[PDB]
Amino acid sequence: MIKATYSSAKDFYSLLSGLLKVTDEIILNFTEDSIFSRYLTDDKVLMVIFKIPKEYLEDYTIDKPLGIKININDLKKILGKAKSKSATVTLEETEAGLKVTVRDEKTGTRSNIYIKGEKTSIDQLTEPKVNLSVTFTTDGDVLKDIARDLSLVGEEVEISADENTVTLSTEEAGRTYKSLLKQDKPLKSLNVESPSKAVYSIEVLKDVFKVTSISQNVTVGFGNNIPMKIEVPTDSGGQLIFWIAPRL
C-alpha cells in the first residue's frame, strides 16, 4: 500500500492551516511525483493547492496512484502533538483510511491516529497555464503587512510593475493606498519580462497574503489581466500554491 515520510511535522501543519475556506474534508492525492491536495472555493476565484514534491518524501512506497478523502481537522490535531520542531511525519495507507504518525526522536516520543477516509480516484491538478510576465520574491511578513494595509482602504487591489518597481493601489470613499516594492526593498528578487497590470479582490488577496507569512521566500507571479500565482515554500519542501482570478 501507500507509505510516505515527511521530515517536518511543523511545516506540514503550517501548510494545512493555510488552506483558506477549506471544508472539513479534503482529498489527499498520492502520485508518483508528489502528494498533493487541491480545491477551488465556491466562488471559483481562488484555487488553493497543497503540494509536496516526491523529492521531499523519503521511504516513499506507492503501487499505483490513489486519493484518500479525509477529515483535515483530525490531521491537524495529530500534527500539533509535535513535541519538537524536528518531529517527522509518516503517512501510511489503511483499509479503513489513513494512518498518520508523528515521531520525535529528540524527546523519545511518538503519536499516531487512524483516520477514516473514503478512497477515490486522484483529483487531477489543473493549475492555470499562462505566462507570468512579472515574478518577484519576498518574505511573507511583508505581504502580511500589505494585507493589513489593504484591509484598511480599498475594495480592489491594482497591482502593476515596470522594469524596476511593483506597485499596489486601492481607493475607497476618498481614501487612497499605494505601496511600492523594489529590489532590496523589500523584494529579494524581481523579474519583469514586460510592464504588466492586473486587478484582484482585496478580500481574497488579503487572506492569502496573511497566510504567506509562514514562508520567508514567497514567490508572486502575475501578468496582464491573468491569474496571480503565489508560492509559499517551506524549509522542508512542503509547498503552498495559490491562484487568484483577476477582475476583468
Binding site: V142, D145, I146, R148, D149, L152, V153, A173, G174, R175, T176, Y177, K178, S179, L180, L181, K185, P186
Partner: protein, 246 residues
C-alpha cells in the same frame, strides 16, 4: 507642505491619545511648527499641542496650511508604523493629506479633507497656585494604576510640596503620594492646593508615555487642571481639564 518624522512610533501615540477626546483634528502647519488644538464634546477637556519645526528632521512649510482629517483613519495607519519607520506628511494640492510610511517597504495613504472647526481658547488668563514636574513614565504608570482602581473622579491635592492623587470611588477612595522624596516628582512650586477632576479625562492622557519625557502638573481650586506633556525640541501637549468633574 512637506514634513518628515524619524521616531514615528512615539509620534503616533500623540494622535492615539487624542482619539480618547476628539473625532476630528485640524493639523495646523505654521512657520513656527505644527499646532494642533481640539476640545472634547463635553467641553471638559481643552487640548493645546505645539510641535515645533525642530521636532522634525525636515520641515518645509512656506505659508500656514490647515488640514482637518478624521482622527480614526489617520490613527489606523499610524498604528502600522514600526520602530525603524520614517514618516512623511504632505498635501497633494487637492488639500488631501498624504501619509508616507518608509521602512521595509514604502507606502502612502491618503485621506480626504473635511470641514475643520476653529477652536477658541477657553481661558484668558490662568494662575496656578501649585505646579509640579515629574517623569511622564512615572506619572502615566500611576495614572494607569488609577484607572485600574476605578472611580468617578481624581482628587489632586498639594500639601507641603507633595502631590496626592486620590482615585475617588463611591463612598471610598485610594490615594497615591508623589514627591521628590519617593521619586514621584522631580520638583515642586507654589503652595498648597486641592481640587477634583474627572477620572476618565486624566487617565485618557496616559498614552503620552512614549512621546513625552517629562510632564508638568498644575492645578488649583475651581480652576482647570493643566497637564503639560513636554515634547522634544521645546514642544508640548497641554490638557486642560475642567474642575469638579465628579
Amino acid at each position: 507642505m512637506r514634513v518628515k518624522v524619524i521616531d514615528a512610533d512615539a509620534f503616533s501615540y500623540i494622535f492615539r491619545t487624542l482619539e480618547e477626546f476628539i473625532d476630528e483634528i485640524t493639523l495646523d502647519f505654521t512657520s513656527d511648527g505644527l499646532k494642533i488644538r481640539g476640545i472634547d464634546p463635553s467641553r471638559v477637556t481643552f487640548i493645546d499641542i505645539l510641535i515645533p519645526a525642530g521636532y522634525f528632521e525636515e520641515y518645509n512649510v512656506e505659508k500656514e496650511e490647515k488640514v482637518g482629517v478624521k482622527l480614526e483613519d489617520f490613527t489606523d495607519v499610524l498604528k502600522t508604523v514600526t520602530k525603524n519607520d520614517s514618516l512623511y506628511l504632505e498635501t497633494d494640492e487637492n488639500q488631501n493629506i498624504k501619509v508616507t510610511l518608509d521602512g521595509v517597504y514604502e507606502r502612502t495613504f491618503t485621506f480626504p479633507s473635511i470641514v475643520a472647526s476653529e477652536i477658541e481658547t477657553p481661558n484668558l488668563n490662568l494662575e496656578f497656585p501649585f505646579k509640579a514636574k515629574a517623569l511622564t513614565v512615572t506619572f502615566t504608570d500611576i495614572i494607569d494604576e488609577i484607572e485600574d482602581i476605578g472611580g468617578d473622579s481624581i482628587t489632586f491635592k498639594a500639601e507641603g510640596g507633595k502631590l496626592y492623587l486620590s482615585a475617588n470611588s463611591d463612598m471610598g477612595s485610594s490615594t497615591i503620594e508623589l514627591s521628590t522624596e519617593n521619586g514621584g516628582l522631580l520638583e515642586s512650586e507654589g503652595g498648597d492646593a486641592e481640587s477634583v477632576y474627572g477620572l476618565e479625562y486624566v487617565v485618557n492622557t496616559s498614552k503620552m508615555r512614549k512621546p513625552s519625557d517629562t510632564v508638568e502638573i498644575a492645578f488649583g481650586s475651581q480652576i482647570p487642571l493643566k497637564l503639560r506633556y513636554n515634547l522634544p525640541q521645546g514642544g508640548y501637549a497641554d490638557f486642560y481639564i475642567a474642575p469638579r468633574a465628579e
